[PDB]
């Protein structure tokens, strides 16, 4: 199953982590094994100033996570890239994903 495995990267550069991981997956043409990097982490909320409506539209706890199937080689691919500060999940090196309730919760959060 295309599981929603969670991982934490270098904060602040989390968008840079998202694009680096996206480019790495698109280079190795492994789309049939991996998925997205949680682009919905874009809360359009902003500080709307007068006469200047520049809105970055970025507000989320971060935690760039990739939808992926558990494999050792794939783990080595996703750790070979930079910004692998923490590969969270209760395990030695092979974690478990989260149930679909939290997936529906984050889908609601994206809906808002």
């Amino acid at each position: 199953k295309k599981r929603w495995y969670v991982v934490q990267a270098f904060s602040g550069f989390e968008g840079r982590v998202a694009t680096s991981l996206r480019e790495h997956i698109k280079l190795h043409n492994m789309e049939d094994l991996f998925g997205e990097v949680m682009v919905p982490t874009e809360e359009v909320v902003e500080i709307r100033g007068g006469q200047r409506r520049k809105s970055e539209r970025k507000f989320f706890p971060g935690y760039v996570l990739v939808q992926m199937v558990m494999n050792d080689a794939s783990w080595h691919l996703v750790r070979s890239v930079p910004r692998v500060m923490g590969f969270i999940g209760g395990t030695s090196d092979r974690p478990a994903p989260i149930s679909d309730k939290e997936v529906d919760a984050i889908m609601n959060r994206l809906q808002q």
Partner: protein, 48 residues
């Protein structure tokens, strides 16, 4: 106490700030992030 922790206006745009103040700021930021996680019904692994 504030007057006790090193924070003195240095020459220029920079000011000498205690190294403990960085850890204090990081602790407060992590506590705020934790408070935000539990309020949003976050998964168990992220709050862990």
């Amino acid at each position: 106490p504030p007057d006790l922790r090193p924070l003195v206006p240095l020459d220029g745009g920079r000011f000498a700030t205690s190294d403990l103040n960085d850890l204090y700021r990081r602790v407060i930021n992590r506590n705020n992030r934790l408070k935000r996680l539990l309020d949003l019904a976050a998964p168990d692994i992220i709050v862990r």
